[PDB]
Amino acid sequence: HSHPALTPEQKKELSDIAHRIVAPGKGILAADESTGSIAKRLQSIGTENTEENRRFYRQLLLTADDRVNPCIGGVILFHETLYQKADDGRPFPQVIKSKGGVVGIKVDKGVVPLAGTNGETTTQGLDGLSERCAQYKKDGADFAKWRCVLKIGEHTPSALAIMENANVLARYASICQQNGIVPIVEPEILPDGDHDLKRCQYVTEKVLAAVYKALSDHHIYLEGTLLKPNMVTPGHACTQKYSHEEIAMATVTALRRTVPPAVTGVTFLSGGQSEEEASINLNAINKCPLLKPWALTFSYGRALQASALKAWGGKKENLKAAQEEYVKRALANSLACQGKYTP
Amino acid sequence: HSHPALTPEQKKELSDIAHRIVAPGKGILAADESTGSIAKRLQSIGTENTEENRRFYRQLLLTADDRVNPCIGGVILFHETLYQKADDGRPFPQVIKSKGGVVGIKVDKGVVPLAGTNGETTTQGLDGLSERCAQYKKDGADFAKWRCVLKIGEHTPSALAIMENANVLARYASICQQNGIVPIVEPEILPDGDHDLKRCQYVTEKVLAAVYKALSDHHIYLEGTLLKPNMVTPGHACTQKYSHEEIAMATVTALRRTVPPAVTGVTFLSGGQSEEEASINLNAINKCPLLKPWALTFSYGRALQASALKAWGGKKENLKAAQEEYVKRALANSLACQGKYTP
Amino acid sequence: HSHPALTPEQKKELSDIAHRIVAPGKGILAADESTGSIAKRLQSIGTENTEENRRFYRQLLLTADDRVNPCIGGVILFHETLYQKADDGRPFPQVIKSKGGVVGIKVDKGVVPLAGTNGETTTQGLDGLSERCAQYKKDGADFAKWRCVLKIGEHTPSALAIMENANVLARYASICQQNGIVPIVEPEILPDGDHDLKRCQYVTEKVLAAVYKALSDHHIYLEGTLLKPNMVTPGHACTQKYSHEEIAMATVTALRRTVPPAVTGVTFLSGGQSEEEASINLNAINKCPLLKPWALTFSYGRALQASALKAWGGKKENLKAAQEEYVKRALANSLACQGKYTP
Amino acid sequence: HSHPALTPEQKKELSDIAHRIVAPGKGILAADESTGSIAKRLQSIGTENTEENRRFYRQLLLTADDRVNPCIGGVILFHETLYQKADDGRPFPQVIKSKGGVVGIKVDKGVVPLAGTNGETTTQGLDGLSERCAQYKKDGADFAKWRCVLKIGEHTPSALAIMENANVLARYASICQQNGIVPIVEPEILPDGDHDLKRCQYVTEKVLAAVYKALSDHHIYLEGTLLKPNMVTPGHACTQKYSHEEIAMATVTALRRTVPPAVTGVTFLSGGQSEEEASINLNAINKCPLLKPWALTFSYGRALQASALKAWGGKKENLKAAQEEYVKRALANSLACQGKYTP
């Protein structure tokens, strides 16, 4: 017997927002860095960590030129930055929505070790969820983010880690669809270790298949969802060298073997790659001579912003040039969504 | 850790045969009717059941006009009919392969009731499988068929039935890929009962998702496989009336929500429909304004042949006209594969 | 490959505490009633809801006669009542530990509806868990409680509800064993509805088997755990009448068919029964002529205390007599643990 | 909703036969050796392989002294030996039933490699099962045997192997209970390799828990079943030395952590051990100071018979002395069932 999770209207608005996210040429910036993370990056530039610093850095990120307007469809934010206002007086979700962007928010509470395993973890943030996301829906957020972590090793990932991860991810996605906010499924696989393309392709295949089995168990609506996997990439200590074309071919085979086409879009991680290399890989991924029944776009935290970071210097008088560098990468990533990029 | 089931060459030949099955405009005839089934159909025409009768009826089926040659890509056979020869002297697999067809064979051993359930069944035929299919591979068969049965009721299908069915189906498919013969996954849902389109859509969604989870557990190669589901159709005693367009829309939604696009083709059942109605439904299914990343074709036992049955009369002097009627339906089904049919 | 969740010492102390809980003749009082619950019960006696009222009521509950000392081995508490002190000045966990009791605490955050289902729920309280239970371990709590809810209906429980419930319950139990606090598994089945003994026996069998499969997936240590199921009882609107002996026989069959004997003890719910009836049922359950390889004891929230509630009147001058009534039931339940009770 | 697999009468007769199998002091001989196996053992004694040889060897095995009559409760047979008759004229099942024994039969069809894995296998023999076991029930067989194989290695057993193995084992057990013949669950783990007691204990724990989850899925009746696991034993190339007491303690912990007590009996494998060592281990297993809620007995193919083999010489004039040696081991194993054996 069936009792529908969603009315047809709710599925319609989730479909509208999901289509608005991965419109062709439009991509996702991840401004969701937590205080420890952004503190590490601001120690890397060598300045102090204050709220005004984070606010001014996101004043750099969000108030850029109008050339980003057919580039950025949505941006993920931290909980803190929702309630900060710009120097014009406008709150940041209005600044995003004015140039056509959609507000996203990182909602998880970090990582917890799994007992009985070897360094595996699961994610935190299940409690108070409906009230929190309802508040964020009142505050204009329309999609959200949850990040689960898996790593390659001797015998890892175990089936326990994959099973629990997909299960709580489905729990997340159900709660997101209950009030009308789009979830993005992000099964992040660690690129750490030394492993070829083949073992990595096998592992993301199994974990993604387990993910979609779990989602189909929980009566998810697939068009009201997004997918945020990693590009399959060999390990940091892997001595074997590969072309971009082989990585892209393994990526589209690992994607095509499990993902149902009723998912509206697929967006990739940075995954610790270079600023130019991730763009090259995405442009190759779009250039594969196969059939892709979804949107293939970019969701880059560091890869969009680390150049603007390195150009900022922590000093205000640079920002525009820094903003310009930000714009540069965005335009490249825009063409990397459409398969027309060349370096 | 990974140990590959197949060498790249084996995956290549399975890909070649799978592409040759669902080439655009090419479809599957099911001449695999068992002795009780064909005895019932020949009691329906009112003649006796002999081996020469079955042989002559398949002389009608296989030796038709050359107009079927860009229509029938493959045909499923019984074990008996592999070892029968035509009046010209040629064995029937050569007669199929001469006009470009591919030999298929029904290999299961029937249905067994499940204990503890309410009229559910599972399928037989797992033993001696590698030797039997290796013999069939020597005898020219390149793809095979297995039929599992599910029904809608008060609380049925239970999860036990779906789980066991998908599990043994995956066992089948693995054994088929071990020697180089293509399996077709056929999760047949009974149209018996009274139930709307929505409950049926829900049930085929769940059972197909469980199927593909099971297949991904068993390291199946997806491009070396086919899918044989039912069109979602309301029950025989269901009083609610529906357009063909709603059935086709529910079909492509139930298909698009679970099937990975690395499956090469999808072919439908007759499912007890009319001769014209199944063609109308398939032509509508191809005419849906969505994105389908596979081949959508027809696999009709009765629906291709019952007209030729009704035109045969059991008497030899009719056959050509009977064969002509067979050709008629095939041509219609051919256009029904391409979306260009009109009645 | 194996990486042990627990060192042998940790398993040893969990075994010590688990043995100390279900020592023969020792049972569990549930003083864990939330503010809405105890507000409903204090509206039932018709007084106001203050913190001093709740404190004075638990002054009734915990400061009773020394005759309860070989009766109550442990007591479950609310988070609020851990930090309240008695009129002598001693904090309540010291008052429990002085007479030999062990401190327990309810840690979940309530119930959340499941989308796509018909009135099913799952439980809240997974976040901040390690820090909270570590704080409770510093504050003297040694075991904890988590309550998940299932109900009988037309097609409910679905497999989704059972699967998610057992999964998050295992997540709970793992986190409890990580720092050294004993979890009790409580799969509460609703007695609401109208259903015979047989359907109920079937449902608790399936959900308990799924529970222990989930626990064995998560590398739980079974001797460091407890089990808190319901006695199988027909529904409130079930017209069929049954003896206590049939209920007890169905209970020990439903218990013996799934529970591994390396669980240290099993303690039952009140389940909305009468004050005398639950004691009669437990005494019959211990009197079954089968083989029980665990402790079978009582964990009664209302059934131990509702008489003392009805004798209290909200007025201080009664308390001792009220306390006496409390003692009465405890002694009965003590003999009901040992099979020597008669009414 | 519930539809019972068995009527209460059927459960009663399965309970009677299961109680008659593992009555205290009564054990199981495995005379089920296939033609290749018994051909290898008769090549080891250095004679020819004929049907009269196998018949005469089982004339040694079954027609022994009356001292075995409170020792052997049941004996497993091959399909061939059911239809062979003794020199007195009596058929062998009557010879077993005359001295109080119960007829058992090995029904599987051997092992098949699993694709995609590293040397894993699954078992054959699912087809024609109801008719075959119904014939065996007419021919006096009351219980049956099925042998599935798992091995320890680098990353093996995979979850696929365990899952498929438990699934088809449950399918077997259901079919056995459908007509009234008792199944014994035999999850044989290979002792080959080099591995400590701990990894082995972990692996049998997981596979046995998965087994009982699968059995509870398929509505098995637990009192109408038996369990045939291995004693946990370190590998052949494992250099670590262990006492018998540690092996027995790990065995009863691995048993007590998953087996429900509604299983009537547990009987062990030989597992390639010595003739004396397996008896010492079983006598220690019964001598553990824990609580065992079942029968713990011996099911020894080679360990009961290899002495009589080595005393036979292939020549008829020895047999009685050879039979005497057989009796010797049986008596020892009888005391090894009761914990009163000493070497």
Numbering used by the authors:
A (entry chain D), B (entry chain C), C (entry chain B), D (entry chain A): 2 to 344
Manuscript text:
Using this data set, we were able to determine a 4.9 Å resolution structure of aldolase without aberration corrections. Using these selected particle coordinates, particles were re-extracted at the full pixel size (0.91 Å per pixel) and subjected to 3D refinement in RELION. 2(e) and 2(f)], which is significantly less than the published resolution of ∼3 Å.
To test this, a cryo-EM data set for aldolase was collected at 200 keV using beam-image shift and analyzed. After particle polishing and iterative rounds of aberration correction in RELION, a 2.8 Å resolution structure could be obtained.
